[model samples]
Target chain A: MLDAFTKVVSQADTRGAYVSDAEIDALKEMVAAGAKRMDVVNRITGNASTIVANAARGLFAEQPQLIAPGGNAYTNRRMAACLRDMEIILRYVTYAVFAGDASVLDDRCLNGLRETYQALGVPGASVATGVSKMKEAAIAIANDPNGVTQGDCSSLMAELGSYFDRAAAAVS
Target chain B: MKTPLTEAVATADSQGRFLSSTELQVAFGRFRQATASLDAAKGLSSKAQSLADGAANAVYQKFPYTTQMQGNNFASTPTGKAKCARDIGYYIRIITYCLIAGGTGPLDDYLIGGLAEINRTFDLSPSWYVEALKYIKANHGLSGDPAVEANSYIDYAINALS
Candidate 1:
């Protein structure tokens, strides 16, 4: 399962995102020491997601307070919506990978997610960067000597890579 | 069943991984109830204090010789009452933050224990706040077996005071 993640990262890095070999080695050590690939990916992605959400929230941290019930500043509202969009997209990609479903990444689904994020005014480049970073981290974990199949890794990596491109396209 | 969460649960379950709708619902419901219970208990405490103060004043006026018995406790003086209220308010916010952050360590004991303290500290009847907890627990625990676990004794505090 760990090796499968690395395979996806290698296959998906078409634009030379430049993951360090040391990072890969660390991931292997963790897996060899009994870290489950799914848990590893979740931790990586979850941390990245939080960082993105926090940065988005910071964009409106200086705005005046609004009077709406259960409301924050307009900037906070927009950022929350943006974060929600990212979560939805991320969940779709994750579910596909976890379920081992390659066909789940069809153009219609990816386009719909992209459209959703685009409507939220999320920056496509930022989303792409965050997604790529998560992939890199997950790939490192997958680089473990565990018995994950190459085919499984390729499918997930391809799905995620395509997902990042479409997500970026929505904002571009 | 057609809800997005339900569908998500179905898919995850079918894949032989993840919690079912029932499991997720129990967890989510518990979380919502806890926040609600906290808010309810805070409001009840504020209202109860005012009513109890008025009652104490009426009794004090009726019996002039009992002045020495009431003493100089913090709950008896205006400044002391205000300070106590502030402390309660601060505790409420701290507990609220902990719940929202999913950090419930020791919070369960604190909620029940705090309510008991408020009852004595504010001169309110122990039965009043204890009943509040029971009331909230029953109201929020309507989902039956699963709901019982989620209430986490929060319902009892709110019910006793509410």
Candidate 2:
């Protein structure tokens, strides 16, 4: 229900206070870094397949049990879902970065996801690992200044990383 | 059935495309809900200027020295207060546009980025305008889904401006 703006206002409102300068500054930073944020989203989006494939490849490599017999991703369908879910998770992180808020990710992607996974015996921890792997690759791709104008985007990159971490934390 | 247009707009903006069919379906659902709350949307639209006035009033009340203060802002005198009120009217109108357009396309179209530079360049207070927006939402007297439906753009601008 909330986005970046209302969340800050609602938090301050519950405390019977105005939105703090710190909160405003964070949001202002989000606005200021709009182009860079878009570039990150564009880079990560263009590299989505590679990122997901590599991440899932690394995931299965590290945790081969996930695809072994009787494991969560053992079945063909199960393996498909595991990769699909990683893409879904990555897409939601992009949504979050676009809005400069976690509400979109939290409200739609992660909400009720764990419970659903629990019922299906899906390993939430494994998904969290895949999410972190995507974070690493996405960050590297986004941070790559191969063909784009580069600037001091350490703060923006930090925010981008936080979205993945948030998604990871949610499912874990 | 209803996905906030703000959400859809952000989705489209991120993906850099028009709303797909599924996205259109999401907006159509809100269109239906909006029909149910036609009166509430109309209520805000009808009192647009008055609500803008109230928003401007709230801003001035909170920052009483706004009229006396001098800077790159329209907060210098009664005339500026009137201008402030006029700007709030733009907010209200654009919010109405978002309500009908089924996305915050107008916000992305009209709301400029680089708020930090604007503040630094203009010596203006974005928070002051933000307060005005908050006031409009708080006092709009809208309830239920329509309340959120109409107010999302306010927060959308609040997000853009901040």
Candidate 3:
């Protein structure tokens, strides 16, 4: 799941080399027409979120969880935070893409985005780093035979906060 | 290979490209002597690039997001959806305003078009449900990527106006 997210992020850049002129032109037209396309926006958001979240769940669907000893239990507040950040950043992106700007995202859009990425490295926030940390989290959860709990979810959420700050700052 | 701007200008006499090794060397030496002049050219390019990115980003914010939110989708839709679209549009407009007001970038072509695309698709109605097989047949639901599809809507909308 982390790899997928990373891929999506990397591919969003020009270096990804797949952005079509049609995409650019379409967005331009969308703007010209107006901003009242919430139905479209909502549907797209809901559809995409479910898919991504499901993928994340599958990673730790069953766990003896990788980090914890014995029955393999892991619990933390970060997962909720991670989901929160996801909701926040994507909301900002939607607004930014359709509406444009971080202000449309959240009251503190850039900060929120920075935090999402930051949450990826918790338990050892400073030492664990990058997309790799995310991979570890996902893999551990996936392998855990004991199944994941709400705590594991929260821990991941906390690790993602780093990027949320960047997002918030970028827009501000 | 492309020579340094100063060297190219000096070696090639006005309106002509011909230059022998000696003339080129002489021009290169002259360029070395006038290093200060090259700095201005470099500075201009640097400034120009920065302006381009800023301008592109600014224009993107100013025109696209807000325009799309209000004009097309909200205007044509039913009350419930339109209101949502309007709400979304209103917030995004604030974002656009802030970006432009920041005083960065030229309001150039790139931004103009980007915004235009955003506006067009945002007004698109009936994005929620498709006759699953019909949508598939129409090639609208292949990769299962909603953002990509939504983005496609924006792209298509822009093309309509362009």
Top candidate (DockQ):
2
Kept native contacts, as fractions per model, are 0.00, 0.00, 0.00
TM-scores, all candidates, are: 0.29, 0.55, 0.24
Model 3 per-residue lDDT tens digits across residues A42-62: 333444455336434543453
The TM-score obtained for chain B by all candidates, in the order given, is: 0.31, 0.74, 0.21
Q: Tell me the chain A TM-score of model 2.
A: 0.89
**lDDT tens digits, residue span B84-137, model 2:** 776677677656545544456545544444556756686778888899889888
**Candidate 1 A-chain TM-score:** 0.41
How well does candidate 2 score on lDDT at residue B134? 90
CA lDDT of each candidate? Answer: 0.41, 0.71, 0.32
User: Which is better, 2 or 3, measured by lDDT?
Assistant: 2
Please estimate how well model 3 matches the true structure, expressed as its whole-model Cα lDDT: 0.32
> Positional deviation of A136 in candidate 2, in angstroms?
0.7
Model 2 Cα lDDT, one tens digit per residue, A16-121? 3433446545655454566676677777878888999999999999999988899998889988888888888888777676555788678867889889888988
Once fitted onto the true fold, the runs of candidate 3 whose alpha carbons sit more than 4 angstroms away are A1-28, A32-40, A58-73, A102-107, A112-172, B1-162
Regions more than 4 Å wrong, model 2: A15-25, B1-5, B9-162
DockQ for model 3? Answer: 0.02
User: For model 1, how does the per-residue alpha-carbon lDDT over A5-77 read when each residue is reduced to its tens digit?
Assistant: 2232333233322223443344333334322324333443445465445434443342223213433324556
